[PDB]
Structure formats: C-alpha cells, structure tokens
Amino acid sequence: KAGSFGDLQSRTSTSNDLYANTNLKLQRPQAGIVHTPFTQVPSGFERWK
Amino acid sequence: KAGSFGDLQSRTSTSNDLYANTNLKLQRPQAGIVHTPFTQVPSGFERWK
Amino acid sequence: DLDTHFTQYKLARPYIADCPNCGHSRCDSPIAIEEVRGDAHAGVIRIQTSAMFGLKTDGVDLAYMSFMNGKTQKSIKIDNLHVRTSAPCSLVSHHGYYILAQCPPGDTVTVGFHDGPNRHTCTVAHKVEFRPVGREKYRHPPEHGVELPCNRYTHKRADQGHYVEMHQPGLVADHSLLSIHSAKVKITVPSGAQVKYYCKCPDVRKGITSSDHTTTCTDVKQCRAYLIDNKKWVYNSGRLPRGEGDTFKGKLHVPFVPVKAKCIATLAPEPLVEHKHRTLILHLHPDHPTLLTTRSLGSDANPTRQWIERP
Amino acid sequence: FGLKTDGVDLAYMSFMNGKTQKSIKIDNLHVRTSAPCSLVSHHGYYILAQCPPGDTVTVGFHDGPNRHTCTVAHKVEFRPVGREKYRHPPEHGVELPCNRYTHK
Amino acid sequence: AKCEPSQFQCTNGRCITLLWKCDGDEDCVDGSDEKNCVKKTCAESDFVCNNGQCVPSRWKCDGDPDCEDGSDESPEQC
Amino acid sequence: AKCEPSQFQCTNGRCITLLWKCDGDEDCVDGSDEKNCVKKTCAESDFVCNNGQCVPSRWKCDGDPDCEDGSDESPEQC
Amino acid sequence: KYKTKVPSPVVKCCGATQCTSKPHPDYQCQVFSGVYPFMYGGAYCFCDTENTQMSEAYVERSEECSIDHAKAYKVHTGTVQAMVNITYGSVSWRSADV
Ligand SMILES: *[C@@H]1O[C@H](CO)[C@@H](O)[C@H](O)[C@H]1NC(C)=O
Ligand SMILES: [Ca+2]
Ligand SMILES: [Ca+2]
Ligand SMILES: [Ca+2]
Ligand SMILES: [Ca+2]
Prior knowledge:
The structure is cut from a larger assembly and holds three copies of chain A, two copies of chain C and two copies of chain E (78 residues).
Chain A: E1 8-10, E2 18-20, E3 25-26, E4 38-39, H1 44-48
Chain C: E1 17-22, E2 25-29, E3 33-37, E4 44-49, E5 52-56, E6 59-69, E7 72-77, E8 82-84, E9 90-95, E10 98-102, E11 106-115, E12 118-128, E13 146-153, E14 163-167, E15 172-173, E16 178-179, E17 186-187, E18 194-200, E19 204-209, E20 213-214, E21 223-228, E22 234-235, E23 248-253, E24 258-265, E25 272-276, E26 279-283, E27 290-294, E28 304-308
Antiparallel strand pairs in C: 1-2, 3-4, 4-10, 5-6, 6-7, 8-11, 9-10, 11-12, 13-24, 14-22, 14-23, 15-21, 16-17, 17-20, 18-19, 18-21, 25-26, 27-28
Chain E: E1 7-9, E2 15-17, E3 46-48, E4 54-56
Antiparallel strand pairs in E: 1-2, 3-4
Bound molecules: 2-acetamido-2-deoxy-beta-D-glucopyranose (NAG) and calcium ion (4 copies).
C-alpha cells in the first residue's frame, strides 16, 4: 500500500520490473512557470525505518 | 557517587585534597590519530542545578 | 587522469531553469537546484543544479565553473561557491551539475555563487535531517566512539554505475533575437545557430532560418523567436521544455554515488550498576537520547525498549 | 539607505560618524535572524528582508575596515498561510490570499 | 497573456501594474518600465544645481554641497 | 610499514585504496598520489589540440574556440 | 526508498497534445491546457490560452536502493550446525564444525 512498507517492491535489487504504489498525482503548473509539480505519499520505507 | 550532587568534593575552595568519583574510562585512540579519548559521567553538580 | 571523468560532461552545457526563490522572488536561475539527495547519515547531502562545476568552455578545470548568461555560456573561476541549509555547509567536492556538501539540519537548502558584483542564489524548501548511526541520537559526528557501518555519498567523481540521461535542448525562446529595425521585424541569427520564428501578424509567417531574415510583421510583439543550438546537450530537467522527436542523446554518470562507509558513533557513559536480590539497578546518565533495551534469557524474553534522554 | 549628502542613489548609504554625517556605498549590508536574510529592498530608515525564524534580529554594514552591527531580541516567526504549517514557501501548491509587506 | 489597460506589459512579455510603469524601480527583469521615463519639476522654493538636483533655498550658499555638483556653494552662484 | 596488497602507500606513509592510486583527486595530503601518473590518449574521432587538449571532431572549425588557444578555429586548421 | 523521475514537459504552443500509456511504474501523464509559460527570454508561447503542457512522471529505485534496502524473506525449516570442542584422556582440545 502507498506510504506503507511495501509501497515499493522489486523482486531483486537489479530487476527491470518495479512495483510502485504511491498516490503520485500531477498538479497544474503555476501560472507562467515551466515546471512539473506533483504530490506523492511520503516513502513508506523511510516511515518504516 | 558519579553523576550525583557529591561526585566532586573538596573541604574548601582552596583545598589541595580533592575527592572525585566519576566513571572516567580511557578509550582506545582512533586508528592513526594522536589523541586521548575518554568517557565520563556528566557532572552531578550541573545535573543537580 | 581527471579528463577521463569529464568525457561525457564535456558534451553537456549548463542551463537556466526556474528557481522558486532567487533571493526574494521566483526567477529563472542559472544555479537552479534540480534535486537534493539527503539520505546519508552524517549529514552528507548531494545537490544537483543546472550549473556546471569543474568545466570551462576550454576544457576541464576544478577551479572553474560554467553557467549560462542568457544565450551565452559563461565560464568563471569558482568564487564563494556556497551551500547553506541553516548554517554554512562545508563543501566536500563538486562535479558537473552536482555539489557535495556537509550540511547541518534545516528546512531549506540554499546554493549560490558570486560573479564579480553579481550574486546568484537558489533557495528550495527541503527538510535536511541529520541521521545519527546506532543507538544514540548524537547531533554532530563525535571525535571518538564506536565505529559503525553507515551510508555516505562518496567524495569520488568516478563512474560507479549510476547515470542520468542528457537530451538535446528544447526550443530556447529568446525575444532578444527580434529587432524592429526599419519598422520591419528583423530576426538576428547568432553565428552557427538557427532561429525558429512564429509571427501571427496580418501576414502569418513561420519557419526556421539559418541567417538574418526580415519578416512581413512590423512589431516584435507579433513574433516569437526560439534559439536552436544543439552543439551541447542538457540534462532532461523537469523545468525545461522537451524537444521534438527522440531528444535522447547520451548518458551522464552520477558522481558521488551513495556507498557503505564506517562512521564514528557516540559511546554513552558507563552506567553505575547496583545489585539487589534478583534485581539489577542501573543509574543511567546519558549525554544524548540513548536507547536502553533488555530481555530475559528464558523462554519468555519479556523485552524492554525505551529511550533515555535524561538521568 | 539609498541617500547620500550629495543626493539620491540606491547604491549609497548614509550614517552618522559622530557629529559628521558620512555617506558610503552599501558594502555587505546584511540582516541575520539565526540565519542570513535575503534583502528585498531598503529605503531611508527601513530595511526589507526575508528572514527565517529566529530569536534575534541582527543588522549591520561595513565601512572599509570597520564593522557596525546591532542585535536586538525579537522573536521572528514564520507564519504559514492556510491549513498546513509549512516552514518555507513551497515551489507549488494552492495560491491563498496573504498579508505581505510590499517591496515598493 | 495580453493584459488589461490596468496593467503595463514589458518588452519581456510579462505584465506589471500600471502604477509601477515609471516609479524608479525596474519591476521587470528587462527594465522596460523604467527604461522610458521623464523628470518632474520642483517648486520655486527649491534651487536647482548644475546636474538638475533640487535643494531647498535655505540650503543654498550654506557652506555644504547638498547636491552632486558644488553649484549650490559655487562662488559663481553665491 | 606495509599496506594491504589492494592499497597504495603515499610517501607520507598513509595507505590509500589502489583504485584511487591514479585519478583526478590527490587522496593524500602529500600529493604523491598523482605525482607519478601518466597522461591518457584520446580517440582519433576527437581533434587533438596543439597544446595537448582533445575536442570532438564535429567541433573542429565550427566557429567557436573549444581549445584553450582556439587551435580548432585557427587558420592553420581551416 | 523510491525516486520520482520527471522528464521534461512537452509545451505545445497554439495547439494541443495527448497523453499515452507507457510501461513505467506508477506512470502519470496529464495535459494542462490554457498555460502561458515564460522563460528567461520572455513568453514561450504566442497564443494566450490555446497552449498545453504535458506533464509526465514515474517512480524509480533511488541510488541508495543498492545499499539502503530491506530484504523480505520466506523462512522454512533448514539445518542446525554447531562447533564442538572435545578433549579426552591425554588428547588436547580439538574442535570441528558438525
Ligand atoms: C577448546 O577449549 C580449550 C580450553 O577451554 C581452548 O584452549 C580452545 O581454544 C577451545 N577451542 C576453541 C575452538 O575455542
Ligand atoms: Ca517601475
Ligand atoms: Ca548647501
Ligand atoms: Ca587519487
Ligand atoms: Ca570549435
């Protein structure tokens, strides 16, 4: 689950198939600014630690 | 006792006979560094304050 | 050799990107901070910027840095290059786009450099935390103690298998290319570059010119000019407009990769131990929040875990 | 700030040197509240700066080899606008009405 | 976008409140607002030095050069 | 004193990792780490400059001095 | 710990673009219409509202994941080994893994 221990899961540290479950959502760029704002649930691994 | 009010005791402020009871333990110097590391219980007088 | 570490960085150039705080207000900063890596233990953080450090237009020189001064790339000696979170950070090393700094905890990360009378700074909101190693929450690496394994960003520039992609730069919109001239918009094309223009005056005209071109429009506000110069590539920054087609041109290694290292952790004072019938009495006088854990060696561990912050 | 005995110039500063008024170019004019503050603008007696939270407000300037500073006890707090206690202006988010000292 | 008559637009393409069009502060990085301006006159109670700086008449010939040039204290003027 | 087989002993006596024995950084304060290094060659696809620099061929005579002396743009080359 | 990779946004001036699916972890793509971005060189687009910015973002393993990661294991009954120290008669202590 997002923000939980398993939010990011990979079968091995060198695999090329990564499972990611975060509420990654793109926000509208601020008026007149070229940027890609986004909101996301803080890392559940950092939380777990 | 170390860490308590009376860890350091002197009969007078100018006395040459000082009693000290702190867990002063000399630690091994870090590899390649000339220094005298040690561990000691924080002063019991400052703790009493 | 040193040049072997810049073989790919020589193909890239600095760029100007949006910075949330250029001193007092948002601006397009040549030192714009792209990322702050702060997951190392002893406060080591790696900051990625749009400026190039250690490269000059003429080659490699760790005393020199290169940054964009509008359309023109400027190369200057590093002068008061500094990083600040809550207090000045000690700079460990720098590499193209990347700065390695020893920073204390803070709510922000400020990077900036001086160029004569000019001052270029970029302040981003980023919680930088000090991560102590072990069972004691020390606030600064101690002089002496227990040497424990820790995660650190190495000070070495060498390629250790981590890369970032550098892409062909997108259109660089620059209104300084247009001039009213004889009451007739003229497009100035820098030597060796191409200028794409788009005019929507009564006579709608657009295209790519390799040389000075005079359009049918009489007002600069009626036209747009974009500088096309692919001599040097740029990191695919999320703050730069993407180019057309497959803009991917190469890979740039990530310097100062995170590595396993040995850190000196604090060693709390030796407890006073008093013994009673079937009872152990410990007098704990910690210097920093110190974790105390105990367990029985029987069939029921009955574990205890508590942080001791005061005697 | 911005005035000299000879006229107006935002690059110049004027201060009293005992009974004699001295006018100098602004040299390392700084504001500090537990950390350096970004200067927004200055006019006459007034200095506008963006300061992080702190317990003190330090203002000072240099005049050649001399350094003139003044530190006063004043709790400077960050007052986030809205329903979240952010510590520094975000790069992006919701634009909310707020109270600011205009730089003009 | 193009801005209403309540706002001035700099050659940079960005808009600035019309009250800021000419007030001595470059509000747009290009400086298009202050790049075009004109000076205002001063009351008859004020003297004007050679550089055009205005100073009150009570400061004229007072021994202090209250303007960029010394015209307020120049022998030719006093 | 002798270092591990995978280490290099600077003249200062301090051991350094053998991988660091020759690179852009002097890993020991004495600097003897890099004193004995040897300069690398560069691919034939890069125009070697007169003063010893080496720049890609596509940059040769492109109208921009890429070598520290402009050799790539000097009339001797084109 | 994850890393959020955000490629350069596609700014379509006087027009519109469309997002497409890609095989990226937690891939996000959205087209924001009515943008009028400005660069160091001034207004980037000509049209006032007929412009779109396409934002893209996806999740990657951070550089620390090579060193700073947790391994989840399934545990089954395995083996039991011991180091035994034995002496007998006049024979000195001898040991071996068993
Ligand atoms: C076995 O026991 C003897 C005496 O206690 C000791 O000298 C020897 O080192 C022990 N063996 C090991 C492997 O520790
Ligand atoms: Ca103005
Ligand atoms: Ca006078
Ligand atoms: Ca070396
Ligand atoms: Ca060239």
